[PDB]
Amino acid sequence: GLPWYRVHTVVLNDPGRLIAVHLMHTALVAGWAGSMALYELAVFDPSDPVLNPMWR
Amino acid sequence: ITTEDIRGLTYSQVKGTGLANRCPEVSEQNAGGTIKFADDKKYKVTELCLEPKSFQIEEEVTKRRGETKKEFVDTKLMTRATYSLTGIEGPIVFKDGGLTFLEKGGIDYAAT
Ligand code: CLA
Ligand code: CLA
Ligand code: CLA
Ligand SMILES: CC1=CCCC(C)(C)[C@H]1/C=C/C(C)=C/C=C/C(C)=C/C=C/C=C(C)/C=C/C=C(C)/C=C/C1=C(C)CCCC1(C)C
Numbered sequence: 001g002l003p004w005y006r007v008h009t010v011v012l013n014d015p016g017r018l019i020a021v022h023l024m025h026t027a028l029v030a031g032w033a034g035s036m037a038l039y040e041l042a043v044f045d046p047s048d049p050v051l052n053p054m055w056r
Numbered sequence: 057i058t059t060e061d062i063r064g065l066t067y068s069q070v071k072g073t074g075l076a077n078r079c080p081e082v083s084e085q086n087a088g089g090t091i092k093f094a095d096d097k098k099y100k101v102t103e104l105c106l107e108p109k110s111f112q113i114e115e116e117v118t119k120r121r122g123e124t125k126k127e128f129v130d131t132k133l134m135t136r137a138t139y140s141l142t143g144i145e146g147p148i149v150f151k152d153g154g155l156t157f158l159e160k161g162g163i164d165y166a167a168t
Contacts, residue, residue, distance in 0.1 A: 045119060047118050047119030047120075048118035048119060048120060051118070051120075052118075052119075
């Protein structure tokens with residue numbers, strides 16, 4: 001049938017399903033942005049910006 | 057709020073309004089006086105009420121484990137308004153070269 005590396009080619013000629021998979025990818029990326037921000041805020045130390053800035 | 061105004065209000069009006077925590081004040085109309093301490097007359101303080109309106113804490117400027125520099129930062133009150141002291145009274149005696157007030161009663165503390 002369709003090997004493991006061609007599996008996302010079924011949505012090649014289905015524009016609605018293509019919009020669906022693009023939406024899912026966008027959802028995952030936005031969720032990553034939010035989750036990364038939350039984790040960073042959880043582990044961030046805002047006390048000392050001159051000797052312990054964000055990049056340290 | 058003046059003491060003359062607190063007498064006018066009943067407990068029902070004052071309850072739940074935050075006016076009980078507020079320290080009174082002497083009116084500008086009734087001012088410019090002089091509470092002279094006559095000899096052969098022992099005097100004392102009463103109703104010494106202290107309302108703190110600003111709270112500041114000397115916090116370290118950084119979370120460094122060896123931080124020695126500190127500055128006064130403003131704070132939010134977490135307890136609701138029970139912080140004002142009231143009812144503080146005590147004698148006025150000639151302990152030393154001048155008069156002195158000795159605190160001996162009243163609410164005189166607030167665990168804020
Ligand atoms: C946004 C860009 C993009 C898009 C939309 C596509 C889309 C496609 N590619 Mg891919 N491709 C891309 C970038 C992209 N590619 C890049 C950068 C490369 C170079 C490495 C390739 C190399 C490549 C090859 C060699 C082939 C495809 C093929 C395909 C088709 C099927 C793939 C499939 O079903 O995989 C299914 C994949 C899996 C079931 C698992 C993959 C797991 C990966 C390797 C590791 C984990 C990835 C991780 C979770 C997320 C990555 C994050 C990202 C920021 C990089 C599909 C049309 C196939 C094709 O043309 O078929 C006709 C094909 O043979 N692509
Ligand atoms: C003037 C009309 C118009 C507008 C405004 C857009 C806008 C968009 N199209 Mg495009 N598109 C159009 C006509 C239009 N298209 C036509 C006529 C076709 C042929 C059918 C397509 C076919 C097409 C495809 C195949 C794809 C797009 C995609 C996209 C989106 C990519 C960016 C994204 O996801 O942002 C990030 C998302 C957001 C910020 C979320 C909110 C976006 C807005 C503010 C509200 C969305 C709700 C709204 C009611 C939906 C209906 C309107 C729709 C046209 C967008 C973008 C919003 C891509 C997509 O869907 O990516 C996910 C995509 O794959 N379009
Ligand atoms: C501009 C930025 C960008 C671009 C162009 C892409 C592109 C892609 N993303 Mg997305 N992604 C982005 C940002 C971006 N992403 C961000 C910021 C996030 C949040 C962290 C994600 C999270 C995300 C997820 C969760 C998934 C994707 C997937 C995909 C692929 C969808 C098409 C596909 O199936 O291709 C076919 C597959 C490929 C081309 C895979 C190869 C991708 C690179 C070259 C692999 C790099 C090496 C890797 C680290 C080690 C692999 C070792 C071994 C296990 C093989 C495509 C390559 C999906 C995917 O790959 O599904 C299979 C997927 O699951 N992305
Ligand atoms: C394996 C590997 C390879 C290369 C890069 C790297 C080394 C980093 C490593 C990792 C790669 C990747 C791609 C990691 C990405 C992680 C991702 C995309 C994580 C996803 C996070 C998303 C999250 C939580 C989303 C949260 C969404 C929620 C609650 C939604 C809930 C909701 C729903 C569903 C309906 C409406 C109401 C409400 C409550 C909003």
